[PDB]
Symmetry: D2
Subunit: 332 residues, 4 copies
């Protein structure tokens, strides 16, 4: 399926690498009014976090050419003005952070795009998490959301746990790497005042919709989970800390057994499982949505447990965006 990328950022650029790396998505157009063509070459080829592109990248005849494939480059602030159709972009990855409502994201349809995948939670577009509810997608849906990085780590763990023991209620904290929304030194950050404080210096409490959004992705959990985040001074890789109360009793070893099972079978590639003495860097460029850390968790009793799961918030999510598009493409 051919695809356009709106906003060539962390997710835009890594969705582009994941795309090249799958057989199944062809990136044909990129719009980013803040990154010109020769600058796009540089930002793609060099990556502080995930390392140099293993691949070829250049500018040629006004097009970005990756691994010999030529890509139409647009420079539009208003997505309503992007000539996607002409470019041959069937689906658009809305990865700017700034067009997340159906109405705003729907502007890509005016340039002749067929479907939009918003790389974030949406107030009103339907949200999908691969492995959890993607099969609820149907062809009527022109504008969809891939949810967040955090919702993609929480939801698969929660699916497995609810399915086997019943989640009565749960409260989630994510300890999360810094992102591009944050500031290098104490600076302005709108109505979210904590988010402006110096990102390298501080542990920063923040809001997250992800626990509530899981109750959308798994309706039986509606209103049973909420949570929060702490931003901390690492450049990538985040961890979910789920504290939950269960209906059926669950010894820790039975939780481990059932998560290992799921990681090996129907959630292979999405939910991982480890008992190794891992730290955050051990997941850098790991493509899973969620990896259970057996050693790090702790149970108070058979009904009350704290479960820990790792995620590369850039790289895992990026791969999920590709996967959703493949799934959508195959339903057309």
């Amino acid at each position: 399926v051919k695809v356009g990328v709106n906003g060539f950022g962390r997710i835009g650029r890594l969705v582009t690498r994941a795309a090249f790396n799958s057989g199944k998505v062809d990136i044909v157009a990129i719009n980013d009014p803040f990154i010109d063509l020769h600058y796009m070459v540089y930002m793609f080829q060099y990556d502080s976090t995930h390392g140099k592109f293993h691949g070829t990248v250049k500018a040629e005849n006004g097009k970005l050419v990756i691994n010999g494939k030529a890509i139409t480059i647009f420079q539009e602030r208003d997505p309503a003005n992007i000539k996607w159709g002409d470019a041959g972009a069937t689906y658009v990855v809305e990865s700017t952070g700034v067009f997340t409502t159906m109405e705003k994201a729907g502007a890509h349809l005016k340039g002749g795009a067929k479907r939009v995948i918003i790389s974030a939670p949406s107030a009103d577009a339907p949200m999908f998490v691969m492995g959890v509810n993607h099969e609820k997608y149907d062809n009527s849906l022109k504008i969809v959301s891939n949810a967040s990085c955090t919702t993609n780590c929480l939801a698969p763990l929660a699916k497995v746990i609810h399915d086997h023991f019943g989640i009565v209620e749960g409260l989630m904290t994510t300890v999360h790497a810094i992102t591009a929304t944050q500031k290098t030194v104490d600076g302005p950050s709108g109505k979210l005042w904590r988010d402006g404080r110096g990102a390298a210096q501080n542990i920063i409490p923040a809001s997250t919709g992800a626990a509530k959004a899981v109750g959308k992705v798994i309706p039986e959990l509606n209103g049973k989970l909420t949570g929060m985040a702490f931003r901390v001074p690492t450049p990538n890789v985040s961890v979910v800390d789920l504290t939950c109360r269960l209906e059926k009793p669950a010894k820790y070893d039975d939780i481990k057994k059932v998560v290992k099972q799921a990681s090996e079978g129907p959630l292979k590639g999405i939910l991982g499982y480890t008992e190794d003495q891992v730290v955050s860097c051990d997941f850098n460029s790991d493509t899973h949505s969620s990896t259970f850390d057996a050693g790090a968790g702790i149970a108070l009793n058979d009904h009350f447990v704290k479960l820990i799961s790792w995620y590369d918030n850039e790289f895992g999510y990026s791969n999920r965006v590709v996967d959703l598009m493949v799934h959508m493409a195959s339903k057309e």
Copy 2:
């Protein structure tokens, strides 16, 4: 009371500062075989985290003279060889990190100390938290513990919440600054493998006895709390995240009022209360044991809540060591 300090490290130095900032306590001797007299002048004067000492520090006549007061300096590896009695050290703060059992900390009694306060949890020395169970101290105790930084954070809060609502069960996480036991790059840590991984690079899961220890300090909570830690790349200040289930219903505003009431009366100076948009650096050099962050916590319902509390692990704890000694002295 005259005090000697064993281990002139982060805690030993900051206890010394806190002692001089308050005449609460007179420092008369210090032992550290890895820091000579001239070198102590340097390490006490300049502090990366808390700034340059406001006062005078020099070497005269083989002693360390802080604010005009001469301190006897020892250089012994074996605590049994330190002549505390000769120097007048009545109470000894045991802040090396390697003598935390009664048997080992007791060696100070050999050199003529009268009582020992271990600046960490102990497998067997009784543990005290100022404002929670410090009145359980009595003069029959020659060797006591001031518990851990984390316990001093969690306990005052857990007391208020338990006293007023009844904690049925709780799971804790502390997102904690790096300490001297950690490593600059991947290196040997012995039995605790994750802890040897590069401190500036990683989110590192780690073990903590604080939640259990709360059940000693608050006997009604015995066996009702457990937890874990994440070490993250900050140099100081940490945060407790307590997820608890309550017996009696408590609306979040009722929790706020109760906690604020507690900060203003009996736990004043120990448990603080804030509604501001704070981040970790706002607690650097803050002397509270625990500061409840109203805005950062979140309730799922009237019986299931996540409560957030900040602590300067270095500075709050060091002030508590002095306060505990002052109390002890009053009981003599």
Copy 3:
């Protein structure tokens, strides 16, 4: 003199603090369209780097009241629309970073300011360094620059060394803390590609005009000095490394004596001198422009030496802005 501040950022806030810590200067107005009145109360009160403000800050009656003094608050993007005259702002500190030419900074003259001090180098506004060429200021200058933090570090030192030994030629590097222009993760920086790379992850080469600018401030050194920068993952405090060739022979002890003599007389408060085993944090909130580090430099021979000098880029510079205004006012 009454002062208005345009851009209530790292420098604008710290100038404000320095003004209140010294009555040197009265702050009467502040403009920042990205920080409302209530939000200013927050950002001024809490500072990750320099700590909580010691004094009072609140909003009353649409003004910002610091230490009892009410300050008029504007929210204009266009400096021409700020009514400085109505608020009584005689001098305007232009600390936004986006109005550094005479033509742009001059727009403050439209709203009724009398003179403008740009808190950065200027392509055309004359530049002054306290203790080096501030007596070249005269009342014919409506728009002046206080140069850069780096220039304020390099110039006092280069003056002493030149005055006494004759700098034939020099090459400078500054190893410099991160600033607000940098990015938390790899992102767009426009024309300056290295600067958009993740600030907490990298050693980043960067351009600096400081060495050349020294040749304006010290006309005899015109064309005799150039340099570069490395941005590194600290939040504050930077260091000059000046490698120079000398005309007259200077033994390193002669250099030390000359510099120390300079710190004790005419450049006292501007150029500091130390022999202690200092590191960057020992200069956090230090008001000097430049602190010579005797121990850290090294001579190849009597004519070829590497000289090291520390500066708090935020705090030293901010104090210099106030000092420059006080001087200006004395000349009126």
Copy 4:
């Protein structure tokens, strides 16, 4: 050639990976009294900086088995007691940091080792830098030094520059990643007081022998270079900043031309060359000893220049150790 590794640290473990990766060195014995066998598995397989070993690692029948090759594991504090000969270890990589003199390093010969390669500068063992003076090695030399990471970055650049233009004199600064000798928080560090200050917080001035040691590796430069270091808060990758005065005039483009030439021909794989807008992370796991950064340098005039060269201090040096051993092996 079969080899033993004394000290399985950063360099010990990466020399081991580089060894597997060449065809030509077989690691057969490892001694490290602080890392037991199952711990060795973990420390080899997981690397925060260079990523998971792409390879197999396990413990079997009391031996460390990497990629099917079994390795004898010793646990001796005194290298005089290590049974290398029995193990079949012909050469030993002395990578503990603690046996760097001929006499101390010579203890490995008592256990039947034939030659020792000390992974650091030595006060008295002869030092080699591949590409610069390795051909001065002869079979009489049983104990040698591979110099330092910094000497390996400086010396190839200096060779090329001296060869073409004449280095009259030079002064070098290295801006260097933290290492395992440094401390996570302000702590003791012997007679080198700065080195104990908190490594994540500070820019730290330090000593280096590397500029002087280049005058050993290139005798014509004896007494013509010296320098210093700054340690800064990155976990790996360092940069040399060489300020030098030249005999023959050299336009910057002629310097670039001659370094590019050398990187392409006789210093291929040792000295690299780039004009890209690179930052430190772009060299992570780069095997060169030295990569010239054309864009980052700056010339004052044709005789006085500042040259910049990057190095992965762990990975580049590690590969050089292997290379030296191959060279030594082929001269036997």
